[PDB]
Amino acid sequence: EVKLVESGGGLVQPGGSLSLSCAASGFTFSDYYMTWVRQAPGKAPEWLALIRNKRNGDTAEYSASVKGRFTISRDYSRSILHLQMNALRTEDSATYYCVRQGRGYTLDYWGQGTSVTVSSAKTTAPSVYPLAPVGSSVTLGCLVKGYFPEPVTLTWNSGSLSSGVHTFPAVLQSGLYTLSSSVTVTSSTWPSQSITCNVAHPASSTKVDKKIEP
Amino acid sequence: DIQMNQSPSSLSASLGDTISITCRASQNINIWLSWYQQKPGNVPKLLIYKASNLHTGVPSRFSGSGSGTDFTLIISSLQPEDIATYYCLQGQSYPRTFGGGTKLEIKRGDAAPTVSIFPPSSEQLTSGGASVVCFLNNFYPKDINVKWKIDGSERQNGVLNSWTDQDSKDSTYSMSSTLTLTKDEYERHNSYTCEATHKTSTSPIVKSFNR
Numbered sequence: 001e002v003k004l005v006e007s008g009g010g011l012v013q014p015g016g017s018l019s020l021s022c023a024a025s026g027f028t029f030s031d032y033y034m035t036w037v038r039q040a041p042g043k044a045p046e047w048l049a050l051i052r053n054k055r056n057g058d059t060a061e062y063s064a065s066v067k068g069r070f071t072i073s074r075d076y077s078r079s080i081l082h083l084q085m086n087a088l089r090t091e092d093s094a095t096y097y098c099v100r101q102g103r104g105y106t107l108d109y110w111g112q113g114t115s116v117t118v119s120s121a122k123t124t125a126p127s128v129y130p131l132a133p134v135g136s137s138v139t140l141g142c143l144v145k146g147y148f149p150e151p152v153t154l155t156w157n158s159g160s161l162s163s164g165v166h167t168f169p170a171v172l173q174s175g176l177y178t179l180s181s182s183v184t185v186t187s188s189t190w191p192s193q194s195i196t197c198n199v200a201h202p203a204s205s206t207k208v209d210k211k212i213e214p
Numbered sequence: 215d216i217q218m219n220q221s222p223s224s225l226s227a228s229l230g231d232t233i234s235i236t237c238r239a240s241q242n243i244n245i246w247l248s249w250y251q252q253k254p255g256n257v258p259k260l261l262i263y264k265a266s267n268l269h270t271g272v273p274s275r276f277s278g279s280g281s282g283t284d285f286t287l288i289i290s291s292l293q294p295e296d297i298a299t300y301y302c303l304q305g306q307s308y309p310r311t312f313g314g315g316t317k318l319e320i321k322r323g324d325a326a327p328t329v330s331i332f333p334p335s336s337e338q339l340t341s342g343g344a345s346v347v348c349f350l351n352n353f354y355p356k357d358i359n360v361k362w363k364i365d366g367s368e369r370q371n372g373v374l375n376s377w378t379d380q381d382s383k384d385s386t387y388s389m390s391s392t393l394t395l396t397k398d399e400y401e402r403h404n405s406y407t408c409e410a411t412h413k414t415s416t417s418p419i420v421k422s423f424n425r
């Protein structure tokens with residue numbers, strides 16, 4: 001299976017720089033032109049750069065929005081695609097994707113993406129608050145406040161509890177995000193069995209577990 | 215630069231319906247036109263390349279047609295999993311350009327929200343804040359409003375709302391509403407209530423607790 005794994009994203013101040021990397025596997029890397037495409041939330045994807053392969057000199061093309069500020073490159077020794085980003089602005093915040101061009105000028109396989117936030121707001125770890133109820137089924141929750149930047153990853157029982165969950169998009173207020181999640185189970189499931197909110201925040205290298213108690 | 219214009223920008227259709235989405239290029243692009251589906255929270259995935267060719271693994275319910283400037287994606291027999299934004303992409307010229315997308319929403323019967331209210335956690339109060347949370351879950355249509363009241367009075371400031379995208383299994387929507395106060399402001403009042411206005415009731419559904 002074709003796989004593209006981006007890394008290097010994170011929070012950077014306006015005016016700063018970042019270097020993204022993309023590890024390719026599952027195809028002959030040298031046979032494909034490669035690209036970077038980004039997507040801001042609720043906007044269409046925006047293509048940023050393409051690099052050809054050795055026959056064409058590893059030559060490249062850029063969108064006007066990044067030409068002169070971003071540089072695409074590729075390392076055949078490790079099958080890694082890179083994007084160096086300079087002079088970043090708040091409008092440069094998005095999920096960045098490593099994307100292969102296949103035959104016929106199609107962008108055929110996209111990575112998972114790496115999140116980039118350009119902001120002068122500082123990294124802060126989240127507070128995680130358990131939300132226990134005040135017949136039949138019961139809804140419990142987890143409130144995550146006080147953090148920056150996105151993303152957090154929220155699971156229930158370390159990912160073992162995935163049904164009945166609603167994890168709400170994070171909302172920004174005054175430089176701090178709030179996120180929440182509800183989980184609905186049978187009243188015979190809880191409190192007799194343990195239900196715990198886990199919140200990972202890579203930007204602060206924090207993983208918080210909060211058991212919901214009566 | 216080649217502008218890709220997609221139509222309609224949003225569509226609501228019934229399960230089992232045939233739908234038809236359009237992409238028009240501002241210049242000839244021959245057959246270099248691909249279509250993508252992006253399910254909520256997911257990355258874009260290729261459906262059709264070279265205008266009309268089905269990508270490996272993409273249900274035969276999807277098909278594409280067109281050449282030159284005007285292209286169409288058909289989805290036969292709409293399934294709940296098809297909730298997504300669809301985008302086209304031209305690969306004729308640089309810069310590579312995408313259409314602005316068509317957001318697909320699935321029609322379904324009305325469903326009232328299941329509403330749950332949560333007083334501040336003792337951890338939060340220890341640290342000095344007091345958030346009260348209401349979840350309004352699994353409802354349809356998407357249109358909803360929430361009103362907070364403290365001892366019977368409308369509170370507006372301090373409220374943070376978030377909504378999920380459409381659920382790909384039951385085609386419902388959910389919302390969370392968090393009212394944040396100081397611990398001291400919270401302790402000056404007793405009654406906390408959230409009220410949801412929705413199609414499914416002529417009067418607000420309310421949930422309440424008394425500190």
Ligand SMILES: N[C@H]1[C@@H](O[C@H]2[C@@H](O[C@H]3[C@@H](O[C@@H]4[C@@H](O)[C@@H](O[C@@H]5[C@H](O)[C@@H](O[C@@H]6[C@H](O)[C@@H](O[C@H]7[C@@H]([C@H](O)CO)O[C@@](O)(C(=O)O)C[C@H]7O[C@]7(C(=O)O)C[C@@H](O)[C@@H](O)[C@@H]([C@H](O)CO)O7)O[C@H]([C@@H](O)CO)[C@H]6OP(=O)(O)O)O[C@H]([C@@H](O)CO[C@H]6O[C@H]([C@@H](O)CO)[C@@H](O)[C@H](O)[C@@H]6O)[C@H]5OP(=O)(O)O)O[C@H](CO[C@H]5O[C@H](CO)[C@H](O)[C@H](O)[C@H]5O)[C@H]4O)O[C@H](CO)[C@@H](O)[C@@H]3O)O[C@H](CO)[C@@H](O)[C@@H]2O)O[C@H](CO)[C@@H](O)[C@@H]1O
Nearest residue numbers: 031032033052053055056057059061101102103104105106
């Ligand atoms: N060019 C173009 C354009 O023009 C424009 C521009 O100009 C600019 C620029 O230039 C340039 C660029 O563009 C680029 O180009 C490239 C070329 O053209 C080509 O190439 C190719 C490749 O390399 C290969 O291919 C082949 C194969 C392989 O081999 C296999 O492995 O593959 C295939 O098959 C596939 O895959 O498909 C293809 C093939 O090819 C062919 C054949 O058949 O062969 C040919 C071609 O042409 C075509 O036709 C194709 C189709 O599509 C089909 O038909 O085919 O190889 C080849 C050979 O060699 C081999 O024998 C070559 O050729 P040539 O002729 O050149 O030799 O082509 C490319 C692309 O298009 C392709 O695509 C395809 O493929 C891909 C891959 O796979 C490849 O590998 C994929 O990805 C896709 O999807 C598809 O499929 C082009 O690119 P683009 O980007 O454009 O697109 O580059 C160049 C460089 O390179 C060159 O040179 C070098 C040195 O330097 C060396 O010599 C080399 O060899 C060569 O090639 C460049 O030059 O840029 C420059 C710089 O900067 C400048 O100066 C110029 O000016 O632009 C302008 C402004 O805007 C304008 O004016 C112009 O016009 O376009 C046009 C119109 O459209 C046209 O006509 C032209 O051609």
